[model samples]
Target: SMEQVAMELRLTELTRLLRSVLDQLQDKDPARIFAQPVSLKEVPDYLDHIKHPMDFATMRKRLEAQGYKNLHEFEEDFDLIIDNCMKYNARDTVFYRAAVRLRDQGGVVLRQARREVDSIG
Candidate 1:
């Protein structure tokens, strides 16, 4: 069907574009590159409008040390985080800032992973 063909073409194009962007961000770590919005301007308002003193690098390094190759990987550990929040006070800390960045960037990683998986199939 025409629709099927168009869908396949778009999926193929999707992976190509993702790969192209990865190529452009060679200096940035693959995981780091994907963990945020493609455009700085598209980032969450808190990223710009709400300012805080966050140790962004430390947060990223710690999360990466846990072997979060993709956002999905990090998400798997949320069970414990939820438990912690339930057991303790859940409020924005400096750490929250980093975690939010991880989540924001992870969205990109999820997109890239989708492209990679679709291409594999």
Candidate 2:
């Protein structure tokens, strides 16, 4: 089916773009603290505050596991990583500022690719 082939190509390009998005986020984090799960012993109530905790490592794991079905899923988890930090930390805190920076900078990367992804149609 021509349509099916077209969709397959679209998804392949999408996967490449989304993976690049993850790479940029992983590189952007200064301390790489968001690379893995937050330690429960350190945050104590982290789970209590963030219902769905997200990190680059987890996202990469899921991506490799084929858990991500589409660009929106990737976007959701990416936003969640920043959202969890902003929600848990003080507005003036460094963690909060990092989240803001990631949202602004990382978001630009994601959004730009998003438009390109859309243009693929």
Candidate 3:
């Protein structure tokens, strides 16, 4: 029950965050998204690559600042937070990335959030 609530809350947050990123991607050549319409399978893989694999602290500071440039910087900070959740806070970043599914007018998993998580196998 608690997880459902948490998942719902996080889904709302994910909806907002994803929509924000999607907005940034608006008006691009339709072909870009047409070829790469976000999928449910790529989010974790995306976050996986953006990870630190080390305890990086300074990068977190930038997120707490004003200049906060680079639309691509979300993962750099998100991963650190998620990484610590796993490494220090004992949280599962896997479920964190997979708990929600956003779909489109076609009723398929929306492209971006739809992308699946990266895997070793």
Candidate 4:
């Protein structure tokens, strides 16, 4: 249960961070630069590419559509995105481990805690 809670909390935090970043970029001057909306449909294949062949062309196209001037600029943004993703991934992993522990123990405390965690933002 604690693990579930942790995962939920981490997911909420990730959502907030994503929204904040997108909001900031959305308000920037379009004349100078534009931020493109990433397609959710492409994410699965894109992630697969990252793991095996490590092709970034799809990502590059998305960034360029958003007005990233060059590879250097895209790289900078990519680094920031990866950093956030890694942090959230770590949190989720910990939460999953905790959830497994709770499942093994089988107590009301873990269930309640997990419920509370799910209620978080």
Please name the candidate that would achieve the greatest lDDT relative to the true structure.
2
TM-score of each: 0.31, 0.84, 0.25, 0.27
**Residue pairs in collision within model 1:** 35-105, 35-106, 36-105
- Global lDDT of each candidate: 0.41, 0.83, 0.36, 0.39
Model 2 residue 14 distance off true place after TM-score fit, in angstroms: 2.4
Ranking by lDDT: 2, 1, 4, 3
lDDT of 2 by residue, 1-121 (tens): 9998887776776677778878987777877768889999988988989999999988998877556668888989998999999999999998898888888888778777778767864
Q: Tell me the number of clashing residue pairs for each predicted model.
A: 3, 0, 14, 4
Using TM-score as the yardstick, the better of models 3 and 4 is: 4
Q: lDDT by residue for model 1 over 40-60, one digit each (tens)?
A: 355444334323222224334
Worst 10 residues of 4 by lDDT: 29-38
Kindly provide the TM-score of model 4 when superposed on the true structure, using C-alpha atoms. 0.27
What's the lDDT of the predicted structure labeled candidate 3?
Answer: 0.36
Deviating ranges (above 4 Å) for candidate 4: 37-121
Indicate the TM-score of model 1.
0.31
